[PDB]
Amino acid sequence: VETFERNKTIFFPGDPAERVYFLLKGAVKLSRVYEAGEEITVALLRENSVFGVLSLLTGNKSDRFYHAVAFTPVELLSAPIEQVEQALKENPELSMLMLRGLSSRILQTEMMIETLAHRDMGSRLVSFLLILCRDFGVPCADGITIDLKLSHQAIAEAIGSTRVTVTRLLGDLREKKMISIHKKKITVHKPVTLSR
Amino acid sequence: VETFERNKTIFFPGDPAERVYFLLKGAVKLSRVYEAGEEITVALLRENSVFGVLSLLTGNKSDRFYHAVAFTPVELLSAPIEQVEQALKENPELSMLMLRGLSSRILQTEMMIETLAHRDMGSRLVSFLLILCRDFGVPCADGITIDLKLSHQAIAEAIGSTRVTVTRLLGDLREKKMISIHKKKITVHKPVTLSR
Ligand SMILES: O=C(O)CCC(=O)C(=O)O
Numbered sequence: 001v002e003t004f005e006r007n008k009t010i011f012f013p014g015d016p017a018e019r020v021y022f023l024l025k026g027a028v029k030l031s032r033v034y035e036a037g038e039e040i041t042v043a044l045l046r047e048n049s050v051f052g053v054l055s056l057l058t059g060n061k062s063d064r065f066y067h068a069v070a071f072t073p074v075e076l077l078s079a080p081i082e083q084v085e086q087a088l089k090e091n092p093e094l095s096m097l098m099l100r101g102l103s104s105r106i107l108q109t110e111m112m113i114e115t116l117a118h119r120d121m122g123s124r125l126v127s128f129l130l131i132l133c134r135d136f137g138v139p140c141a142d143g144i145t146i147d148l149k150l151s152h153q154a155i156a157e158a159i160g161s162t163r164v165t166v167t168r169l170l171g172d173l174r175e176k177k178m179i180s181i182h183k184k185k186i187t188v189h190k191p192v193t194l195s196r
Numbered sequence: 197v198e199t200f201e202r203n204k205t206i207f208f209p210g211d212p213a214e215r216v217y218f219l220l221k222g223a224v225k226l227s228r229v230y231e232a233g234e235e236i237t238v239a240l241l242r243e244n245s246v247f248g249v250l251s252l253l254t255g256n257k258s259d260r261f262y263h264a265v266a267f268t269p270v271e272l273l274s275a276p277i278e279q280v281e282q283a284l285k286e287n288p289e290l291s292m293l294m295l296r297g298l299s300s301r302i303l304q305t306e307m308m309i310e311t312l313a314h315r316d317m318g319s320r321l322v323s324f325l326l327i328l329c330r331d332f333g334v335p336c337a338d339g340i341t342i343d344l345k346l347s348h349q350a351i352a353e354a355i356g357s358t359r360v361t362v363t364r365l366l367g368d369l370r371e372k373k374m375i376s377i378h379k380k381k382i383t384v385h386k387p388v389t390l391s392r
């Protein structure tokens with residue numbers, strides 16, 4: 001069981017795709033990185049996700065092109081591909097469960113496609129927040145607290161927007177009392193009604 | 197082998213998720229259908245993709261929420277979920293090959309997250325076409341031909357835009373001599389350079 005301090009890198013673009021990973025605790029951010037250091041978020045992975053799947057294809061013969069970061073303190077398992085490939089070719093059942101895990105990854109990414117497809121950033125934001133509710137939400141008298149520290153920057157990198165825009169949108173959502181924010185934990189007040 | 201005419205439905209929202217599918221020839225469109233009747237594209241699957249993967253999660257106890265349509269004339273295989281779990285037992289190797297196809301689906305979806313992430317609708321379109329060039333590309337004296345009838349509406353539904361805007365953007369690109377269109381098939385003239 002490995003641990004990663006918050007903001008520690010799990011793999012860098014350019015690193016051989018040596019291992020597969022399983023996320024026990026915390027959130028992992030996958031992103032694409034650009035020459036100047038800008039990053040675009042491509043996935044925010046929730047507990048119990050398999051990831052690093054490019055090694056399931058090319059194994060260490062190929063290089064990472066996304067950046068994997070411990071978005072919160074993380075705990076995870078990982079194993080070179082042949083170790084995995086052995087464990088599978090050996091334990092048939094296990095594979096049925098990784099097939100399920102991968103199927104989940106795909107359905108989750110497609111939900112982000114849906115979030116990103118909205119033309120107006122306001123809905124893009126609510127929709128992204130509703131997903132986080134589901135992935136990391138904690139029940140509350142108000143509604144649901146997204147148990148992650150979310151900077152305006154981090155949100156911008158994930159819904160395709162600038163930070164200034166996120167700030168304005170977030171302020172608008174509070175003015176209207178659909179959300180509260182405290183030390184970066186966002187609480188969504190009426191999740192179910194927001195899925196309108 | 198099951199064939200489907202262009203624009204025929206392979207599976208509708210509400211259907212039991214009982215089968216896994218394999219795409220042999222053509223392109224399959226996955227969408228979310230909305231209350232009104234508008235449709236948002238979540239994936240354009242290319243030949244040799246596994247899909248319907250919701251059925252490897254629950255199976256019957258779960259109803260399709262996406263719409264699977266033959267975007268071009270299509271041929272595919274399919275099987276009841278419990279038959280898949282069986283051949284998985286039989287051939288612990290076939291297993292790995294599913295794992296790998298699922299891995300590739302994940303990566304393909306993430307690459308669409310990147311497309312949608314662009315703020316500049318022009319760039320988002322160029323990026324969507326590059327995808328199409330590698331997914332449905334055919335080498336050309338002129339560069340790479342995307343082998344698909346693409347209406348502006350269809351492009352709009354996949355890049356979170358509208359017909360009108362797509363028409364303007366395609367024309368801009370054509371003025372720059374950057375793409376060509378014949379019979380609704382688009383040719384991208386220097387895709388390797390554009391990748392910039
Ligand atoms: O596997 C990689 O190299 C990038 C994408 C990824 O980590 C996955 O979503 O599992």
Ligand SMILES: O=C(O)CCC(=O)C(=O)O
Nearest residue numbers: 246247248249250260262
């Ligand atoms: O499995 C479905 O029901 C929806 C998503 C899907 O078809 C997949 O991308 O393979």
